[PDB]
Design a protein around this ligand. Structure first.
Ligand SMILES: [Cl-]
Length: 158
């Protein structure tokens, strides 16, 4: 099954950690990386005197079950990133989100796929479109039509 994973890092110095995260993704059992998007830059959310986010998408071929893949992405987040000191609930320094898992729809305590908000996020959709321009969502919606209808602004490259 092809899973699509979003990577995000809002570290002041992210490119390095992102590359380490990619290595970790490629080390996941019963899996291999098919494609990695370009690295994109998105502005901080809120105060503009904070670091930009580096965003990318990864296509990962895997025979793991969806919750098994989650085990690994969670492990990698714990190993390669951390929560923020004075805000233990905000974005971690490294985010790995399972955006899509084949054509599967999943709604469990641990896992919701497709990612609940991805259709509203250029940071997810644009890198995804670079690596899977012909993608169709489980509900039948075309990635190309979402980007066109919703008239998203493109992201700058990192
Ligand atoms: Cl969907």
């Amino acid at each position: 099954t092809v899973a699509y994973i979003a990577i995000g890092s809002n570290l002041a110095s992210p490119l390095e950690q992102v590359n380490a995260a990619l290595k970790a993704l490629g080390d996941i059992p019963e899996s291999h990386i098919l494609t990695v998007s370009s690295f994109y830059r998105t502005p901080p959310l809120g105060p503009q005197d904070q670091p930009d986010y580096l965003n990318a998408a990864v296509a990962l071929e895997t025979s793991l079950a969806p919750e098994e893949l989650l085990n690994h992405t969670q492990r990698i987040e714990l190993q390669q990133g951390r929560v923020r000191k004075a805000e233990r609930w905000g974005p971690r320094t490294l985010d790995l989100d399972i955006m899509l898992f084949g054509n599967e729809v999943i709604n469990t305590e641990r896992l919701t796929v497709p990612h609940y908000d991805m259709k509203n996020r250029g940071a997810m959709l644009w890198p995804l479109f670079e690596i899977a321009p012909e993608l169709v969502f489980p509900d039948g919606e075309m990635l190309r039509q979402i980007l066109h209808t919703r008239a998203f602004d493109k992201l700058n490259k990192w």
